[PDB]
Amino acid sequence: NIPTFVLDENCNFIPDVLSRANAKFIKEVLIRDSYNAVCLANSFIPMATQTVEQILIIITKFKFSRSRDLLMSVFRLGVHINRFYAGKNQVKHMITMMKSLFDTEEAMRQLDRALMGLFVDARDNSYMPLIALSLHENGLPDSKFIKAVRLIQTTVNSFHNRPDADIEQYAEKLRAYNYLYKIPKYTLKEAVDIYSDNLKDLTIGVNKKPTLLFTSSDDAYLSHIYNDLLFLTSTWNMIYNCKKEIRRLNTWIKYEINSIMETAVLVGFQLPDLKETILDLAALISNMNLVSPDKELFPHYKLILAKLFEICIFATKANICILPSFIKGHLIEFEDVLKRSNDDEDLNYLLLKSRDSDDEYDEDKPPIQVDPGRVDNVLTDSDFFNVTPENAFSSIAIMPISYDKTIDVEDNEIQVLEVEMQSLSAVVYGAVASKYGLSLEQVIRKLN
Amino acid sequence: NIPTFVLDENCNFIPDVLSRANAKFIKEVLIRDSYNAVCLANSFIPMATQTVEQILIIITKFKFSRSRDLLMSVFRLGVHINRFYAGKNQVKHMITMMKSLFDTEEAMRQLDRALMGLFVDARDNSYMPLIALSLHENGLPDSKFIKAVRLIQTTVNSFHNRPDADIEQYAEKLRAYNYLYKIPKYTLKEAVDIYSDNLKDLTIGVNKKPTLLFTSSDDAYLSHIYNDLLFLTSTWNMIYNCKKEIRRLNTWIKYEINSIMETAVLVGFQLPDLKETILDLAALISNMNLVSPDKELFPHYKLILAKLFEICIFATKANICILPSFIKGHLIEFEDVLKRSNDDEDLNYLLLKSRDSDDEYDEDKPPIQVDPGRVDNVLTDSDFFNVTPENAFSSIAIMPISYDKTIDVEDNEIQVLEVEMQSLSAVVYGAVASKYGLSLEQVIRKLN
């Protein structure tokens, strides 16, 4: 389904948005079909946010399937940010090009004359505010676009409308370079050919004013203006919806960025070497949230995405299984076991194999991993945890981690219990203790 | 790459876990490569949780990509629940089979005799705690298993060890029906063939006592015991880890189920006809959470999985774009706009275009969708929302919805601001109002 003209060596990431190195990382980790889908979803073609999501399928090669959960979130975010940035620059140029059609009195009077010609039998003068005065970036939201097109369509009894056979199928090419564009009911293939070039030009950002039929000749006057107005209104509606979709991307991005902070902290539980990277990430997101409501956030997006790719690359090279949901589930279990634990039971007993465990063979004495009275710390498993000796005894990056537990329903309101987890660091300390054969007290004693 | 024996028409879901209609739904919405991967990930082959995840890729046919976000979470959960159930039943049988090898006094004396023979030159009696007394379901965790195999390996100085040709690559087939099994350094291909059969039977659940080479032959005795002890210890280590992984799945499932409640609520924003289904889901999850620890939760898992599939099937039939992350992002933006608004700006003003908005054409008066002073309510878009007239004036299923906003860092500690969102219901009544040509006031007055 992928058009060859959206193929790109950098997966269509703008240099200002993502580094060459990071763009290469994406090609390294995805299977061919997924890479091609990302190319299309990240391409110059205007599309609604839901269309981006349908196309965007992120599938890693088998090698990197261990860190899919992380890579998917980050890559998705990157596509959103890229479309946001690219989109803004694109619609700006579209506005400049479409505005230039009638930015002189002579061009406006030409349009005035054409409108007068087509609307010669009009019931009233509604074509002025609905069409004539709405050919700008705020002029034609969906609701007003529908009315404008219906009004144009009433003028078919003022000229001999003889649509080309199969013009509907013929005009389908007008979405080749633009999936946001709503194709109106054109009548002339001659007109559609011109609008095809116009729309392609608008997407590419070609420095060439749009062509209209009624300003290229004098022939078949009214049918030419009829099709031209359909083009003008649909294209301005498309431009309006570009601005709307850019707003929708911006809104999503801010939430994706705030929510991924917990993801990064959870990754840092599996790979504590990332501590400084994660804290740097937190500072970047803090600075982003500090900004006044009116301002442009892209510079923050750029830095944040870069920092997120640092985390992905490291996590991928570590070759452990990055499963933030699995880790959080086990942090919850740890707190629950701790909460129900007895008083001849400290964290050392709960988190760590006893030193002479391998001397125990009694079946009624479950070893620690299957003992419901102790903790199966998945971070003692080499597939879920690694740290260098240099960072083994540093504090971890931490933020408040909680989850809401559904406990009742009152009519339409679901009741929950917030479970705040405040002893999380212990499982990481327990992982270090296990790796290096120490007690918890010994590990903690690394106050430094 | 998928083994032939794991291909299945119900995606290897146990009937008691998932209905045949729901298994068919899975087959309907996934592409073939994804369906086959799910078949393997959901198969009787013992695997570590991380191995399951590496294999489990959920890819929808393009027709269903609109709801991929929901389907991915529910199907993943389903596989986890299935593996938990199947796994518990399977390891119980494995234990019964392996236990039956030495459950009579005559069988025990034969083993003791075998043991003394092989360990004739042992330098202590550690073969008793490490091996003889650890042939049970709690006997051989990884740390002990390593020591046990190392001890067995020392006995090659007590017999003529001439390992078969090409045995270590030949033994590779012992993981065909078991990916959790650790393959030890066997020496005899006659041994490996017996163990291949044993392991295949164990995974399938064949009511047939395993075979040992030293109790089935006479020839070259000591090398037979040597291989048999490697089989016994590795198989019991595998059984122990089965128990461990079952516990890991159970831990993960509880968190997936609690977290998906919010996902379901968000889907209900887009599809309020699901309100009663969502409130029933909350009651099921509440019941599950009520259960004292640690009882068997599968009856609850079963019901909850079936209720989630109801949500999936309805959302998919609806053919709208189900993006909980996107929706939550826009709930957050609505809150912010609401907070920034003044007393001249009521919800009706913030959420709905004015009556005569399509008469307005001034460029310097941005229409509602691109006006930063008002809300672009994505639920007025037919791609994101639908409801039947019968449910248009029912209140939505609601739960507390919050997000942590990262605002500062000090040392290793990340500081956040909890943002709890009130008035979320208004975006739905705003969608209803827009859908049916009503004011917000006209909607809210009709609510109970």
Residue numbers in the entry:
A (entry chain B), B (entry chain A): 8 to 455
What is the paper's account of this structure, in its own sentences?
HHV-6B U14 is a tegument protein essential for viral propagation, and additionally it interacts with host factors such as tumor suppressor p53 and cellular protein EDD, thereby regulating host cell responses. HHV-6B U14 is a tegument protein that is 604 amino acid residues in length. U14 belongs to the herpes pp85 superfamily that is shared among beta herpesviruses, and has no homologs in alpha and gamma herpesvirus. The N-terminal domain of U14 (U14-NTD) adopts an elongated, helix-rich fold without any significant overall similarity to known structures.
The structures of native U14-NTD and the SeMet-derivative were determined at 1.85 Å and 2.3 å resolutions, respectively. There were two almost identical U14-NTD molecules in the asymmetric unit. Almost all of the U14-NTD residues were assigned to the electron density, with the exception of N-terminal residues 1–7 and C-terminal residues 456–458, indicating that the designed U14-NTD represents an actual structural domain of U14. U14-NTD has an elongated helix-rich structure composed of sixteen α helices, four 310 helices and two β strands. To facilitate structure description, the U14-NTD structure was divided into four subdomains (SDs) based on secondary structure topology and spatial arrangement. In the crystal structure, a dimer is formed along the long axis of U14-NTD in an antiparallel orientation. The calculated buried surface area per monomer is 4146 Å2 (red), which is a relatively large value compared with those of known homodimer structures of similar size, at approximately 2800 Å2. One noticeable characteristic of the U14-NTD dimer is an internal cavity within the dimer interface. Broadly spanning electrostatic interactions contribute to the dimerization. The HHV-6B U14 structure suggests multiple structural features as potential function sites, such as the negatively- and positively-charged clusters, the β hairpin flanked by the hydrophobic patch, and the grooves formed along the dimer interface.
